[PDB]
Amino acid sequence: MREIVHLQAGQCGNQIGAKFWEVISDEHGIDPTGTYHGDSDLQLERINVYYNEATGGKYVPRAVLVDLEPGTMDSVRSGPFGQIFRPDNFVFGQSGAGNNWAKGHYTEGAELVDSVLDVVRKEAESCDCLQGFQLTHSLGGGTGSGMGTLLISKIREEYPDRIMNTFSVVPSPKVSDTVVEPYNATLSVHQLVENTDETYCIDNEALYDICFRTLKLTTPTYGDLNHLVSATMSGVTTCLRFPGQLNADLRKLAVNMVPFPRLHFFMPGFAPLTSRGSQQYRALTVPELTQQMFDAKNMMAACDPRHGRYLTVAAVFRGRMSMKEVDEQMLNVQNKNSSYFVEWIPNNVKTAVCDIPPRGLKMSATFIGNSTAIQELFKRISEQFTAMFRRKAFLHWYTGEGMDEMEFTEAESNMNDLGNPVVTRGAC
Amino acid sequence: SERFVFIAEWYDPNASLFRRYELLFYPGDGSVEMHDVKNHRTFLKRTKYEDLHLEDLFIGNKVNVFSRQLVLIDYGDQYTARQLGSKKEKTLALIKPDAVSKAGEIIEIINKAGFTLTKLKMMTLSRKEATDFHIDHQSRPFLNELIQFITSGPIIAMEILRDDAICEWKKLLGPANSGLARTDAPGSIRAVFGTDGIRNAAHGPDSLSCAAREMELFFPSSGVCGPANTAKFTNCTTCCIVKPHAISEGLLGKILMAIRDAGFEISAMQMFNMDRVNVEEFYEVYKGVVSEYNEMVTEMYSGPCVAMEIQQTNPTMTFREFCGPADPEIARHLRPGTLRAIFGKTKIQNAVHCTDLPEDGLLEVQYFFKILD
Amino acid sequence: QRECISVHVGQAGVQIGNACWELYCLEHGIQPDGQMPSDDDSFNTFFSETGAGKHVPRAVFVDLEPTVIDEVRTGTYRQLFHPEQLITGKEDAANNYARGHYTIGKELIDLVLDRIRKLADQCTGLQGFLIFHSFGGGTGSGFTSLLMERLSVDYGKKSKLEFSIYPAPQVSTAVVEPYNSILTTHTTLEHSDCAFMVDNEAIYDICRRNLDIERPTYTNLNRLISQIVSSITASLRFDGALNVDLTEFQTNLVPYPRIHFPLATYAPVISAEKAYHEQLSVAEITNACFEPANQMVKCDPRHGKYMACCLLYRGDVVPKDVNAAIAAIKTKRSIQFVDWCPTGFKVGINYQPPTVVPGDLAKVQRAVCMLSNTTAIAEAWARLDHKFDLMYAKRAFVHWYVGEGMEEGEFSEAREDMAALEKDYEEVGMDSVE
Amino acid sequence: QRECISVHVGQAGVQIGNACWELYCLEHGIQPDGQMPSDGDDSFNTFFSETGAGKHVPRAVFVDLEPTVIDEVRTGTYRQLFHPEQLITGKEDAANNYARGHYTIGKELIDLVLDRIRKLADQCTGLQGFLIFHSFGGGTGSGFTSLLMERLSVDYGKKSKLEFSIYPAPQVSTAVVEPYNSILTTHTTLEHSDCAFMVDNEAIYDICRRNLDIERPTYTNLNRLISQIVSSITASLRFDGALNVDLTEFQTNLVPYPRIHFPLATYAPVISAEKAYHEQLSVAEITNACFEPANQMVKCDPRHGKYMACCLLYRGDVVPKDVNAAIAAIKTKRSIQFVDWCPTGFKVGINYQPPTVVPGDLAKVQRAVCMLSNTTAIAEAWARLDHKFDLMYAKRAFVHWYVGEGMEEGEFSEAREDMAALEKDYEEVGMDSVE
Amino acid sequence: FRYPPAGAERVFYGRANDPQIAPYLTHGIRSKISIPAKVLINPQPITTF
């Protein structure tokens, strides 16, 4: 019996987690009022993975919702599935986030850490065998960067034998919603490398790429952007909650996807993605699904997989399908393009197939790829930081709140020290 | 802009105090907002909701939003009090002992104008209640005729609402004399379904002051009046329910159409406002049997509904065959002629509920026509 | 929870305030005699709550001389403002920095700090100060300088934004705006965290051209500035997609601790019988803030570098057509950035369309204010620096100042501070060579 | 998706564009207030944009240096159709000077006109090009046209540029400074106009006399035929046809050499209402009518030259292979001719929409053509206006206004050898193959 | 049009007598909304037996 503690740090992580809890409450059959109405008794077998029971069968999420400004907590509460969460877990603070990693790591954020770890420890202790934590946050900006990485550091210090999943939103190349994305993201990654075990990187331009070319929509909203991530988040942890053959939990995904301990940067993907105009003409099968995953337009980070070799690939199918289809189709992918897969790891793909599909749908598949192509997403931020740091710009806030030039240079140096092995293992 | 405010209660299945909230419907685009009266905070921010309609917004109505079911108790503020205030008018309409055969036509012609329907009884008026009803014409040479007509066959009593529903229902009535209605031919209920000026189709109050005493005589506040003309033990009996769905969109007269054109003898009608614990007893034989008993429960008590007793005629085809299968989409292709084939949709929001097992028949008839008024 | 104070200093500050109140009362559904009408938290950022149903404002109307608080105390807005918020002096400052600061500042400065304290008492989180004043007359220059000094002393940790009415580059309204402007900027450089700059002549031209009115007055001028500051305080007022705070504005709008003068521009300024034929689409309303005619100080943005640009999008704005518009903007070679800030945009989405006051502006779905810090504002600084040189070259009007507590050294000190200013703006405007 | 901005400049331009937008409004939907009253979908989005509800406004800018002729539009019936600063007014007429239209009062207007072109182009998804409408006559029609194209060649170089030109008459004319202004602005529009379609006034006078049965035509009736020509040429991208053509097709099939870009326009059914029903107006008959050298709209006889490339635009009920019989009949005639280097000299397009008649002079017919013939016969009109220029320029007539206004004296000469080179290359391409 | 008396618009002389339908409506385009927010398309509602 396994449990996962959910955390939402930052505004972006908070709406992503709100859509997450809506989607998985739909899958597990939980109403907004806390009771149960559903169709299958198989949904209640592993409800004590994400939901803790209470008096009267009112299942509440095992989630802690933290931010430095009380204008996202009331939005989450006033969402449709708002008052499912524990009101003591609404760990807010009357202050300003200030989109500042310094103010998220060495100021009011670090002042609120000592209170949010109390409810994190309570949710950890109210479990029989905890396996992992998952944290939804965004690098670009504050709170989810500063308080998020400090939460990763403290939780790794207190529980060093447990899996740390982090669903992290990285800035896009097309735009920037603030002006200090490199300054936040470099100090984010410098903590995220020597800490968490499974970083799942999400990019907004890749979300628009999916929502316009694949799903064929003209006015996508943040509900849509967080909904794709929610579907991916439900499909990563589904062999642990729903039965089937070849089950795979998060630590098995980690040991089959992380060759070297630093190399744990992944780009997720969900691929039963059909437009409304193409849903009737669709030919939904496993030979279609594997090709839709390995098509390099549905990958939810703005990195081109054709620019680098895949190190490891994991696919979690859901539905009643044949392992003839699955195993031999993934083999024909590995043989169809072999220069885009590494040779120092033979048979470098992982298969996990659930019996229960997502509701309404029949055959789904979630993609997680440890590849070379994360190097573009990281070097881009590296030269953006060199450009914005050679002239000492946007820096007096960090130097006033307590940051140092030496540790800024240390963050950039560690970013380069991870830009090195992604080239080393891609060029053998 | 242009928002509508109401005050509501919700009974939480946990701690038993009635949660007091503030509902807000936006008719410009269908959106719901709720505020909290106990602590002044927000609750379900302004969000699009394509299942709440304008006709559901009424005082004492039973409205479901996000499985957090509400009952309305106040008119919000003075603005929507003006907008939907002196508008709504309660009226008591009476089907005469004649035209009970064509009851469905009359229920349908109330349903046309938007006259929303709240109470429904089928009663054989007692001897003592007649002289209470005949206060309008007391001590004039018509008591013998009007007594002999009124206390002859079962009447159907009706509670009706719309704006200035008094005069709008008088406009359906047309002239009081049915012969005068025929000679005028204005397209009134007596002009289509009358006989004469003592047996026409319908006549009731003339003002709100008379509507008060008509209401008190025919629908009491503790309840003694209607003797519940059901004939509970009639062997070939079946109890069916026009569902709160079909009542809400408005299908009652058309159901009466479809069932009387097959020769089945309707013997009793009543509308009762379902409560949860009472729905459990009518659907007692379903938990464990059907794997979605909860949706049937919440569809039953998600609004008012009319119970009715149907008397078995029309050989070979029983009521179970007239209603056919359970799901309307089973019935749409398989046996494509049933009232559950085409008078209703979905499976949650079916038209009627039958007695299923045979023996289990007088039981239902008794529940909604003996052991529940 | 999230409240900011407004301090109206001087004639110009009071008139900007009058426009702001005339907008905001109908924005929050406040009747002029401040009260909800007969028919949840949006008020509690800029209005506090009083018994029955009254909503009293968060402002200090301070003026060193009468008549100006008095149109407010006599007119249509009597029952809204507190008479203890409405603070009058007794005698005119008379275009004199030395009288706004040194001699008649002391009979009012203790009272105005006591009033700012008593307003800030019922405030759980003080988000910032908004100082509404001009760089012109004695009140708006000297009292703003002294008030900024004392406010930096006793509320130093809070953000302090200014909305300055700059002297005109060509016309000007008196003869001592250069003196007063240089003297007030020398003292308000070191304390004011961010000063939005609005002059009059760019408003005159924009109201003539894109609003098609040839002779409207100062009320119609300040109405647009009220719209601007309405777009400033929008995300701590309503709920949207990206709520951007005043601290958010500060932490992304001033890349160095000395360069703190952004220019603010408004789009949809279209004039009612001027909007049947446009789409008011996101791309064109973004391009309006970039064209060199909606810019609201008389300087050429082509003659400079855009450093950081905070776009506040408001209304029916799908949140990623703005992605498309910004991607289109970053390719035009006429709007050219610096080489050391690639990520030059900050987006803030608000879900509440603008409400129009009875007046001249069209009632539209969308509205953006641009908050751009440019190296071209040094070009605006340079004309007033040149005028200051031409008047000080043989001590014009200097005896009126120096007989009133002024010392002769602060003129040279302020000229040297101006020297540091355009030195700062040139060596931050230069590109990378290392 | 398939749009083109129209720039009506000069007084000739604003009247011909007024006829243009009148005919476009009598076409699909649009009541003259600007609203389409419901009762082919995308058809408006070539000439009209679409605001909220519906207020379809033209992709047109109306420019001149003098008022009262824009003010007639702003006080006319179509005052609500347009947007009030698409119509831009100067305050001082250029007054028959190329130098005044191009060199002193152009800077008060060129920046604002370029800005509104930029705003219109930003209000456009995929731009085919710019259809400008002017004359070779007065200063507003010549100098501002030259300055506008000098800016638009730099700013929108790849886009198509099609000119609709009111050329001065060979024999009548309305002023005296047509040779000066026409040659001076042709010297500048030679290297900038991707293609320049030309029409003369005396030719349409003759057409309206001999076919419209009207003896005293006014310029509203003159410009109505130009509106028909334009609504025929830029028509196949409005609708769907058997053979779809657009402006790039027109360029690539009409322009053989980068300097040879002056085709001639000719309409068919110019017939006159109480004449339309005694003929059948067959495809062959209307084809022979538009190759007849009596319906050309530039007064130069096509038999004094060789056709180099011709395009036919059959609009209406035209089966597309009676066209083949008509073309085979034309290519065997001995009175028409083509150059020896162009065997395939015909480009044909067919559209299913018959011509829409306005209340006026033309007849409602189901078939019409739009003729574009790139011939060497235009060189005759070119050379005769050159002769007028030489008689002008013999002893310095009228040049003192231009030189005291601001253009340099040698531009008058430079336009003359530019037009001399334009004379020379016509016979260079018209000579037969011998090597 | 010629002498604007005050802060009111300079209305054109050929436009002043037209009916003033100008002010009191919404100028711009409503966002085209598209199909709903991925709940109806990405997992679709329900299929029944």
Ligand SMILES: Nc1nc2c(ncn2[C@@H]2O[C@H](COP(=O)(O)OP(=O)(O)OP(=O)(O)O)[C@@H](O)[C@H]2O)c(=O)[nH]1
């Ligand atoms: N928006 C707006 N700005 C104004 C108004 N009146 C003056 N200004 C500007 O403000 C400057 C002077 O204002 P103040 O600094 O308050 O002058 P003062 O100290 O009160 O002295 P006086 O105005 O002469 O009585 C002028 O240069 C104007 O540009 C107004 O009514 N509205």
Ligand SMILES: Nc1nc2c(ncn2[C@@H]2O[C@H](COP(=O)(O)OP(=O)(O)OP(=O)(O)O)[C@@H](O)[C@H]2O)c(=O)[nH]1
């Ligand atoms: N179709 C049409 N053509 C016109 C009209 N008026 C003038 N033209 C033609 O234009 C030529 C002279 O008009 P323009 O060159 O446009 O006059 P302009 O360019 O405004 O020059 P100015 O006289 O300085 O104003 C004449 O030779 C006519 O052929 C008109 O009203 N309709």
Ligand SMILES: Nc1nc2c(ncn2[C@@H]2O[C@H](COP(=O)(O)OP(=O)(O)O)[C@@H](O)[C@H]2O)c(=O)[nH]1
């Ligand atoms: N997927 C998704 N991303 C979002 C959402 N809201 C914001 N973001 C992204 O989050 C980034 C900024 O978040 P941030 O400022 O760090 O939030 P904070 O941590 O509370 O300060 C923006 O660039 C957005 O692209 C959402 O609802 N869903």
